[PDB]
């Protein structure tokens, strides 16, 4: 029932805060991620259409998308700092190194596209609702965020041809973000089994759904 401009405003408003690293490397990241997850859950409940879902459908979408949402946030924060990743304002970094290159490559992409914050909050919403829709209301909401994205592009004086092309190259990013997430959780699960640097309780539950 919301308009595009109401949709955008609602998402920039529910935007989670930028946390700091409580200052071993993966220990700091694990701790940082755990605190971000608490803010992410409350952000998800403020994403229009999410609360309308079954409580068991909510858990599931969060279980599938949490690292994607974390990684797209990191990529966004790292935009103005090429060659480096801004996990936290006080934690800026330069078998995870492969994932680092992909995250760096993704942030270079967003910078080269000059991704807008209003587009960012839409993409992050899409990730939450789509990354586990496979395994009719969500589609309608996904369609709404699509129209919302088009609106933003149009309002900036972008061609109808430019809109379809930008919308495409934006959604093709999510495929990489999905990839980086899948590879990330494969790595996190190894670190758990090898008992190096302990994952938090909530982070353990997020891992035991993959």
């Amino acid at each position: 029932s919301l308009t595009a401009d109401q949709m955008v405003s609602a998402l920039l408003d529910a935007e989670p805060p930028i946390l700091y690293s409580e200052y071993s490397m993966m220990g700091l990241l694990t701790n940082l991620a755990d605190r971000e997850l608490v803010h992410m859950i409350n952000w998800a409940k403020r994403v229009p259409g999410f609360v309308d879902l079954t409580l068991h459908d909510q858990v599931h979408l969060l279980e599938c998308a949490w690292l994607e949402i974390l990684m797209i946030g990191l990529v966004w924060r790292s935009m103005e700092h090429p060659g480096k990743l801004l996990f936290a304002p006080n934690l800026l970094l330069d078998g995870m190194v492969e994932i680092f290159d992909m995250l760096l490559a993704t942030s270079s992409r967003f910078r080269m596209m000059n991704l807008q914050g209003e587009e960012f909050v839409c993409l992050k919403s899409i990730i939450l609702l789509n990354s586990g829709v496979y395994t009719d209301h969500i589609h309608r909401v996904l369609d709404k965020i699509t129209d919302t994205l088009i609106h933003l592009m149009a309002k900036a004086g972008l061609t109808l041809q430019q809109q379809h092309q930008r919308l495409a190259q934006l959604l093709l990013i999510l495929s990489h973000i999905r990839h980086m997430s899948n590879k990330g959780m494969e790595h996190l699960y190894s670190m758990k089994c090898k008992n190096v640097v302990p994952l938090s309780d909530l982070l353990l539950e997020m891992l035991d759904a993959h």
């Binding site: 608490v38 859950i41 409940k45 409580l55 858990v59 969060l62 997020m206």
Partner: peptide
């Protein structure tokens, strides 16, 4: 679960 609790 913890996830259901924070919801």
């Amino acid at each position: 679960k913890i996830l259901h609790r924070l919801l």
